[PDB]
Amino acid sequence: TLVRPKPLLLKLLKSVGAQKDTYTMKEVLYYLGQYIMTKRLYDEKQQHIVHCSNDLLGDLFGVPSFSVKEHRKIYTMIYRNLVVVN
Numbered sequence: 279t280l281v282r283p284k285p286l287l288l289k290l291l292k293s294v295g296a297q298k299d300t301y302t303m304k305e306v307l308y309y310l311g312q313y314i315m316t317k318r319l320y321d322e323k324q325q326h327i328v329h330c331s332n333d334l335l336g337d338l339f340g341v342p343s344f345s346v347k348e349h350r351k352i353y354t355m356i357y358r359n360l361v362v363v364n
């Protein structure tokens with residue numbers, strides 16, 4: 279599947295070195311991961327919990343925090359911020 283991130287998600291992804299406009303779901307996940315890692319959007323205490331209440335990430339996703347294990351919930355949140363392309 280080829281996806282075109284919407285402007286705000288595009289800006290967030292491009293800010294961590296993503297060069298293109300069209301991505302695969304694995305590329306969005308990778309670049310979203312680089313974003314979490316650089317900005318340090320997690321606690322040493324709980325590695326699996328992303329804390330994003332005060333970040334553009336939580337705004338686009340619509341949640342204060344989420345578990346890295348909640349794959350289905352993460353896709354739902356990402357899907358809202360993209361358009362599927364040819």
Ligand SMILES: CCC[C@H]1N(C(=O)c2cnccc2C(F)(F)F)CCC[C@@]1(Oc1ccc(C(F)(F)F)cc1)C(=O)N1CCN(c2ccccc2OCCO)CC1
Binds near residue numbers: 306312325327
């Ligand atoms: C080796 C660690 C890499 C993971 N990682 C950490 O777990 C981590 C390490 N140290 C400290 C803090 C963290 C912290 F905080 F949990 F992130 C470091 C960053 C990359 C990494 O995590 C995320 C996390 C959130 C998102 C986002 F999309 F925003 F939800 C995207 C990627 C990842 O590539 N996968 C693979 C893709 N996974 C995934 C998510 C949703 C749907 C499907 C998925 O795929 C399953 C196939 O493997 C998530 C984990």
